[PDB]
Design a protein around this ligand. Structure first.
Ligand SMILES: CO[C@H]1O[C@H](CO)[C@@H](O)[C@H](O)[C@H]1O
Ligand SMILES: CO[C@H]1O[C@H](CO)[C@@H](O)[C@H](O)[C@H]1O
Ligand SMILES: [Ca+2]
Ligand SMILES: [Ca+2]
Ligand SMILES: [Mn+2]
Ligand SMILES: [Mn+2]
Lengths: 47, 180, 180, 47
């Protein structure tokens, strides 16, 4: 019950190709931490 | 109409519908992108191209996605670098690691990138991050300097559930991170 | 649990989530698998691999798929060879053309094909087909010799709707085809 | 007009753990155009 939200208008049609791939990345540098994903659900629809 | 939908609730060791890049790999029913180790980049992309908009009608797609994730770090002080969900061209490949989070190359805008990302960043990089030094959630389009960020207190070791939704009618992109 | 689900109502020119093989490609917003020209072969696969069973748990999966298709001969007497929906290893590639429908190689059961296929067959190849020489639906596992068949009167040039489903509890595979 | 067929076919005996689903079509000495107009697919596998 501790939440964070951020909305923003982003016309994805101007920045991204028609067909894309989606995913996660994570990185460490001179400091570190384990970055793990426990599940992923996605749905998209285009009319 | 065209739809793509999928869920993965428990990650197998032979999770063949993911494309792994860097040192991202699947283990213990978990997807791990980084272990607690210096200088890594791990990425994983769903194997199918998804049709996000179409030039032949001008239609862009609605999508929603959820995931829960853990950042687990030796203590709350020394934690780096971050995590991202990103949309990118069909052939995308890891870009710079460290502060660039595996998706972008510069803090200067480049439309050649064609990547938008929602990042959950834990290390403050003076050149482009919120000057308060806070960990932050942010939206990034073609650059690692977020178009908008929000401060977030990292609860180290705890799962967090995220919902990112896009409404094509308004082009809004919404992100919530919830710890229990 | 894992699901994968998708729908394509209309087929664009660049249907990038389909893998095409042979002369298969998209046109007039249909997926054309062959045109009316001899000796060809077309297949199209969905780009994501699908997890249909799992060795550590033993669970198997249910699936449903439905699609509408047309066969377009010149006369209902000169038509060959048929059409297929098939499940096969991740790496399948076109196999023998003609009466084998690009999905199988011998009428002899072959444990290394490991492709089961639902065929909608229009031409009688005397060596492995129902002796009444009818067109028909049939289920094939590892051979072009269907393990079971049902007579079918092709309505040449008519769209047909077909649903195929599979239930892991009872291991039953059901095939429906209905000309409206 | 409909035509239905049902059978038991323990897919775990015949196919690999991961698979690709798709359509196939062919002509030989005789020919016909073969075209798909729509396609819906869903699968689920409990863990
Ligand atoms: C000292 O800087 C290094 O460490 C930080 C923390 O990991 C990274 O953001 C940065 O890219 C890397 O260069
Ligand atoms: C007559 O033989 C050829 O034509 C028929 C009908 O098209 C095919 O089924 C067969 O495999 C091919 O070899
Ligand atoms: Ca940072
Ligand atoms: Ca035949
Ligand atoms: Mn940042
Ligand atoms: Mn047959």
């Amino acid at each position: 019950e501790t939440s964070y939200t951020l909305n923003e208008v982003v016309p994805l049609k101007e920045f991204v190709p028609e067909w894309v791939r989606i995913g996660f990345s994570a990185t460490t540098g001179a400091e570190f931490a384990a970055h793990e994903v426990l599940s992923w659900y996605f749905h998209s629809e285009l009319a | 109409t065209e739809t793509t939908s999928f869920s993965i609730t428990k990650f197998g060791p032979d999770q063949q519908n993911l494309i792994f890049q860097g040192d991202g790999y699947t283990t213990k029913e978990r997807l791990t992108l980084t272990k607690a180790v210096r200088n890594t980049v791990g990425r994983a992309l769903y194997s199918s191209p998804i049709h996000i908009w179409d030039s032949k009608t001008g239609n862009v797609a609605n999508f929603v996605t959820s995931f829960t994730f853990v950042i687990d770090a030796p203590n709350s002080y020394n934690v780096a670098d971050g995590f991202t969900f990103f949309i990118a061209p069909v052939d995308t490949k890891p870009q710079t690691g460290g502060g660039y989070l595996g998706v972008f190359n510069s803090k200067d805008y480049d439309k050649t990138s064609q990547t938008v990302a929602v990042e959950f960043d834990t290390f403050y990089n003076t050149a482009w991050d919120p000057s308060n030094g806070d960990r932050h959630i942010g939206i990034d389009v073609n650059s690692i300097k977020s178009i908008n960020t929000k401060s977030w207190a990292l609860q180290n070791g705890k799962e967090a559930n995220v919902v990112i939704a896009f409404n094509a009618a308004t082009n809004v992109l919404t992100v919530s991170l919830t710890y229990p």
